[PDB]
Design a protein around this ligand. Structure first.
Ligand code: MG
Length: 206
């Protein structure tokens, strides 16, 4: 335990890590899928502590009525998405938040962190393409935590956050399949890996 005193929280390659996990319209499946929860956690790059939070629910337009499957899975009821801005508006708000947080200065280095590749490889660019919206350059590089974890632990977490929490002896934070709570769990896992001396790197193909 003194074993880690010098190793823990090493210098990292980024000033900040931006933890993101979407929830989306869905069924068991409807199309196009639309982002209904847009969280970002700004983590101190050294300590992994949460320093700022972006969180918006988003009003879906093509399938505006959340399905029983969607609600029961995500916890997101209709009342939570009803008066809310559209994805385009939410993306402008993210950009304002990036600006306000000093994340758009060329000298300030940050990278998104997600559980899996779906959200930034598939979901965001897919919906943006459908809407005719550009994808900001900062969404185009990320770290898949499942891959970071498998490198650190020599073991693929098939069941995602629940497997990673198990492997690191961490109690689950909040509610599974809630965007923000998944973000808090990603952040907690990162903290523990950093405590063990893990240096995070882009996993996203350039
Ligand atoms: Mg989630």
């Amino acid at each position: 335990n003194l074993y880690f005193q010098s190793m823990s929280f090493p210098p990292q390659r980024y000033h900040y890590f931006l933890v993101l996990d979407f929830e989306a319209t869905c069924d068991k499946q409807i199309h196009p899928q639309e982002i209904i929860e847009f969280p970002i956690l700004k983590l101190n790059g050294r300590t992994m502590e949460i320093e700022s939070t972006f969180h918006m629910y988003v009003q879906p337009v093509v399938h505006p009525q959340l399905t029983p499957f969607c609600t029961e899975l995500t916890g997101i009821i209709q009342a939570m998405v009803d008066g809310q801005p559209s994805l385009q508006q939410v993306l402008e708000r993210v950009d304002e938040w990036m600006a306000k947080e000093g994340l758009l200065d060329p000298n300030v280095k940050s990278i998104f962190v997600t559980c899996g590749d779906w959200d930034l490889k598939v979901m965001l660019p897919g919906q943006c393409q459908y809407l005719g919206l550009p994808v900001a350059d900062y969404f185009k590089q990320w770290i898949n935590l499942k891959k970071a974890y498998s490198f650190a632990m020599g073991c693929w977490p098939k069941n995602g956050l629940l497997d990673m929490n198990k492997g690191l002896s961490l109690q689950h934070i909040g509610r599974p399949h809630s965007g923000i709570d998944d973000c808090k769990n990603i952040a907690n896992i990162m903290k523990t890996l950093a405590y063990r001396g893990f240096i995070f790197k882009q996993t996203s193909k350039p």
